[PDB]
Amino acid sequence: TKVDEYGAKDYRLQMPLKDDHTSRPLWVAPDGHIFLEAFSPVYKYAQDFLVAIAEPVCRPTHVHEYKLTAYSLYAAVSVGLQTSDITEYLRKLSKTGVPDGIMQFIKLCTVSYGKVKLVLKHNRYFVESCHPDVIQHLLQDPVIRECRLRQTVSFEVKQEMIEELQKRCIHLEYPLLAEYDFRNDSVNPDINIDLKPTAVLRPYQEKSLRKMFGNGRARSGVIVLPCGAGKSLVGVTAACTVRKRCLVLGNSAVSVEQWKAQFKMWSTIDDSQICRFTSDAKDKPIGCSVAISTYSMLGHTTKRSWEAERVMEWLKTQEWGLMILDEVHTIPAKMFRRVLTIVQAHCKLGLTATLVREDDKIVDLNFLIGPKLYEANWMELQNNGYIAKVQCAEVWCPMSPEFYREYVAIKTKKRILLYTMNPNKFRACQFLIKFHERRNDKIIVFADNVFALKEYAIRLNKPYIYGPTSQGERMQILQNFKHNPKINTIFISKVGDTSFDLPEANVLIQISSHGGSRRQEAQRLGRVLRAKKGMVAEEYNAFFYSLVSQDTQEMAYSTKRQRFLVDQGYSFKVITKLAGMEEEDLAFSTKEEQQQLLQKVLAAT
Template structure:
């Protein structure tokens, strides 16, 4: 067996990859591994990745071959890649596209409407449109034809290499196939939708020059694929602040069709509308808002996930699902697709004849439904590492700090006897955090500072301490927009916000975020909160992200898990004790991202992996 000690990687037979952080080739290896493997743990010296079928299929959808993957592993590995791993990678990646879904010759993709209830029409005996599942491998088609989960969607066996499936269940067929290990390549095409000429402006309505950046153009091309049936569905992954909305506008220009845009909240809906009016040729009467406050259905309609999944006390189904049939949409855009509600997956499975674009900063879903995003929205079409955009100054340079404060003496007994969930809340709301938060805000008094938290009572206390306004889920939209406007204009320097500001809030001048509590170990939330401050800045173009946590508690363990995604992107957290941070701030000194930076992990067993090199 060959041994190459200069390399940073060990490939294990269980499909885990161990990557040495202190190796000169670490960064190059990490960038390559991110294309086809998932980061699992990131203690300070060795990071653990795992190769999974879904990670390999996303790589395959982006053009990687099994040979590309194996060459990368051989290039960086200390030892030979185990033969079983080689075989598994080849077999798994070979499965992508082994089964294809096509339309009968000369036939459109099929009905794209949404029924009121799942199962309506199945087995009714009436004539239905059909699509064809085909594979050159007869044994695979035989296996699929006899699988009990697929049988309800079959119409008939056409021949040895083709099955007819009910076109109404196109999405359900794809879900089944990805779960049994045969990710289908959907080539059945799309309905074009009602035409709507859309052009991007060379100069915005506000009078600024405008054009897509090079990576935004690449993202549009990767999704659109010249309008062929091989494109038109999938997910674009870009960091917050990198212009995912602009990519959406670029795709809309390509499609030039009536478009339904789904987003997270009313603020995000209005930001989409503002961008459309500023940067495209669309007029105001062509853009509708479909939210709890307005029900406008126009050629471009922007709706919230909340209104789609809203049901009254007497509703047996979702009354607003009718929006999907209200126009001849040719394109559906899912903003923040990692937050797509489970109920919207059901609708999405039934509109597979529409082009579908997902936009997100992270494919991580806390409910584990990444496979449904893959099969129903589409595979990852484009991804660019955050640090690459940072180096090109398209997003701000981020410095991340974790500051650990002791649990307040008055809470030690309550914490000791509490249940696990209550332990986390006690640690999160630790009043010992408050002096540090005040010192950080005072230190950055000339900058735009967001203080972000989870618990309303804690946020209200912080707002009183800082004499700063607060935005929560209870804040009326008009008041939210007024406060956001004051913050963006610089009239307001500090804003206290709940998790309503995690998503799709455009605050370009925010340069400091202080996180005082979060949602357990949510990796996606950590990414979104850092993203609030990543838009390019004047001057040094540096953003600072502080996470204030209670040491030696469950909050510290969950914080390590939260930081996992950002570690994958190449960020490290500098660790400080509360006393050390306070002494530096009192002396007017900056906390340094150098020298004390460590990577963190939260192991599967829940134990802390290393305490790093934090100063006492």
């Protein structure tokens, strides 16, 4: 609305500056953005309060940035905070008061809660509201009557239409409450599972659980925790908390195996009580209460096998007290989201290390699952030592002239290969590998295109890993890498970042990436976040290097791809050249070698 002679939005006509603004560490913008002095004496209280009421945008070292959202406001009401309570404390923290536009915005979002609640009973879904009249106006659109099946008033809703109705309810300004009173529920039988005292719960984990379990009723939503932060333990703890039949869904069979191990590792539950409903393996799922499977299995669009149909019908008919969803960034997919309509679950908890995707469907998680129940501050976890200090870097590999000549000439998809394969990027990786290998550092090499992966790994005489590599060959390489001292690096394709349980490594070199996507970048970095046998956070023991070809599309993709990491606070140090690479003996030391590779690169046709 108001803009100065400069592009900055100004709010002098919108809010005043309080008398003790120097003591107050926060500002409230009329557009919903919020800033917080991380160095302020009350930062601790303000951080908790802003994580409770707002959505974090950036959390750098000196000033954090947040924005208000209906979902974040609903979460605030979900922990019992009244409009006056958040307003009074926000005004007290705000050094420039609260703009009336935000105050009235908060009013609407606060009063629009508690009015309508969705609950399921006897495999039937009922929409309840305390006020009886609200239903009459809320039903004024036939989409609800067609969705509706043919005090505390309620009506039953057609299961298949719940997704459409729930999304409408948001833009209809009447969100559905999803608190599940697992404590006062005798209809769904409890399960004999508890967290064994061997399990250790960290403060951030405890915070996320406390925020999810704001009362005796579990709240649905998404918890964002790094893979190294023990997201699996939180999920297992939530199941142990709900004490009712629960369904865990992983994005891969490897994850399903990981979950089984974690459940046995952290809970009193026995192996027979856990089943891994999977096409590749059978555990007689109907024989036990805890089930584990994948979106590909349940979400399967084609004809089901007769045996798998037996379990699925049993799964369909049973009601799940808790539905744990891992790597929910995939959930908004057209097929994966169908799982939410197929399975009947009282409360659904989503977990993921990278709640980002290149499509505008991430926001669906707010209605498909719920608001962000928690989102760890990765810098705080490093400061607390829970995550390894990773000195990220971007090596600006200069492209070779004969490569650039072709790269600039070829505008088709073939340039992705040419910018991925050049002597300088190759020599740089070989040099960094040799250096870290002679430094006795475990190194993981990452790539996308198999052609470059092969030609690099073969020229480096190192074992690569990719899709068609059988599980036996694949794991045998990991065991050698982990244990054999003579091997210290592995060349992994997307298989390593998509979904896997790779052994932790001190160093990671990414020579190729699918694009400027944030998701894959943070998934790759996640592999090195694991704490080592004797490291310390100030040691800067972990490393992460992105190899990019200067003056190429890789530069655009790389900067675009790092957005999520810089938002979390990571410093991508640019490396123009590495001292010693001029004298170290490396491949492509003569133009004929470059020409030979370039010729074969062109032969790719």
